[PDB]
Amino acid sequence: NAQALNTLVKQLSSKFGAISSVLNDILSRLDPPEAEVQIDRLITGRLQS
Amino acid sequence: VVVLSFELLHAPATVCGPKKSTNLVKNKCVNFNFNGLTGTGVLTKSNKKF
Amino acid sequence: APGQTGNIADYNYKLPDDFTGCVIAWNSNKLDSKHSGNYDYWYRLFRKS
Amino acid sequence: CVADYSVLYNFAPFFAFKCYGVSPTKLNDLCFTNVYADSFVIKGNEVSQI
Amino acid sequence: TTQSYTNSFTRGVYYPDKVFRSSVLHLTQDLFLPFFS
Ligand SMILES: *[C@@H]1O[C@H](CO)[C@@H](O)[C@H](O)[C@H]1NC(C)=O
Numbered sequence: 001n002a003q004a005l006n007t008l009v010k011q012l013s014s015k016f017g018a019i020s021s022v023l024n025d026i027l028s029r030l031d032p033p034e035a036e037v038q039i040d041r042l043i044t045g046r047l048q049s
Numbered sequence: 050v051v052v053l054s055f056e057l058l059h060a061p062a063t064v065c066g067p068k069k070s071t072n073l074v075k076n077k078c079v080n081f082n083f084n085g086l087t088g089t090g091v092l093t094k095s096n097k098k099f
Numbered sequence: 100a101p102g103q104t105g106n107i108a109d110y111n112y113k114l115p116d117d118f119t120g121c122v123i124a125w126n127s128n129k130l131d132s133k134h135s136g137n138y139d140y141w142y143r144l145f146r147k148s
Numbered sequence: 149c150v151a152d153y154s155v156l157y158n159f160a161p162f163f164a165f166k167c168y169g170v171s172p173t174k175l176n177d178l179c180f181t182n183v184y185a186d187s188f189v190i191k192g193n194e195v196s197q198i
Numbered sequence: 199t200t201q202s203y204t205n206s207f208t209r210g211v212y213y214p215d216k217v218f219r220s221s222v223l224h225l226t227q228d229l230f231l232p233f234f235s
Pocket residue numbers: 203204205234235
């Protein structure tokens with residue numbers, strides 16, 4: 001059980017082919033018409049985990 | 050064609066931009082903008098020997 | 100355009116990013132342009148907002 | 149040096165202004181580690197594929 | 199002038215980054231001096 005939860009929380013540092021692994025940096029740097037593409041990559045990657 | 054190449058997410062520099070500054074608040078749930086770092090939390094002094 | 104804004108766009112007319120439609124245009128060197136000079140029309144640049 | 153990216157529409161920032169990995173509106177509140185600028189000259193034609 | 203070869207032991211390691219870390223085992227991928235050279 002410890003291994004499963006340890007690996008789940010370490011998946012948040014991956015990028016899944018995006019600009020950065022933090023939502024705030026993406027939102028504060030890119031415009032909404034374009035930043036929605038970058039966020040879509042994190043959502044699909046984190047939903048799989 | 051002037052190219053204004055730059056990097057990000059490194060040691061902070063003087064070149065930031067035209068924004069103001071405020072005082073400090075502690076032990077309160079407050080958003081922070083410590084030179085790009087955006088988020089919320091509670092700020093407390095400790096003994097982390099940097 | 101739905102994306103990007105220009106000097107006239109951000110100060111006179113901004114197009115929404117979620118825009119569904121067509122834009123049609125053509126030269127008006129004789130329709131809206133006077134052969135002796137066109138100055139009746141005006142454009143705004145000092146909205147400050 | 150504290151910069152000011154409000155130099156838009158002063159002499160001639162027209163024709164091409166597209167950015168990469170950043171939006172033009174968000175320059176005013178982004179602090180950079182370094183700023184790198186070059187001002188080479190080209191033939192001003194189809195060779196603009198840089 | 200006069201040359202020789204000797205073992206480098208386990209020297210040639212530094213602090214790759216200025217990010218503070220405590221009680222962790224980080225795995226870096228930087229340029230180093232290979233051990234026992
Ligand atoms: C280093 O170089 C010397 C001479 O080239 C050689 O004798 C030696 O085996 C090499 N390796 C070590 C670990 O000394």
